[PDB]
Amino acid sequence: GFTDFDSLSGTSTTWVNELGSVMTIDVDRKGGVTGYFVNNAPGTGCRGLPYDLSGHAHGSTIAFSVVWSNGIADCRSATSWAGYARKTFGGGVQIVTQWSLAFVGKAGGKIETGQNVFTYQAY
């Protein structure tokens, strides 16, 4: 059924990345993305709490952002993802993303990049 992100308009979906961190997103009729990110990555801060997520999806690309502060736990960090839709020959749907990370540690501000692959959960 999935053609591109225009297929998510009006839907509520859960996605998991390769370290078992979970994004639950509502995509509105115009491709506006709202929802929650839960960090489960071992040896990271701010685990197991929902963090507000916001972004936008259009055609075959998507981008979304979290700041790691929610009034419960603050990890002095922010993450954003930019990505594209990938159809597996298995049948399923993935978002291939590159994340950008900014944080303030003991040596002040730092920026990092890496990959995350999100797999649609058919709940």
Structure tokens at 81: 């993802």
Q: Does 46 bind a copy of itself (CB under 8 A)?
A: no
Site string for a copy of itself, 55-84 (x = CB under 8 A): xxxxxxxxxxxxxxx----x-xxxxxxxxx
Tell which one of 90, 108, 122, 123 touches a copy of itself (CB under 8 A).
Answer: 108
| DSSP code for 89 | T
Q: Does 18 bind a copy of itself (CB under 8 A)?
A: no
For residues 115 and 66, give the distance between their C-alpha atoms in angstroms, rounded to a whole number.
Answer: 16
Q: Does 17 bind a copy of itself (CB under 8 A)?
A: no
Could you give the dihedral angle defined by the CA atoms of residues 113, 102, 78 and 12, in that order, rounded to the nearest 10 degrees? -10
Residue 61's region, left for phi above 0, alpha for psi from -120 to 50, else beta, is: beta
Contacts of 1 by beta carbon, 8 Å cutoff, 6+ apart: 7
Q: How far is the CB of 71 from a copy of itself (least distance, A)?
A: 8
The region of 15-23, 41-49, 97-105 touching a copy of itself under the rule CB under 8 A is 97-105
Residues that bind a copy of itself (CB under 8 A): 30-33, 52-69, 74, 76-86, 96-104, 108-113, 115
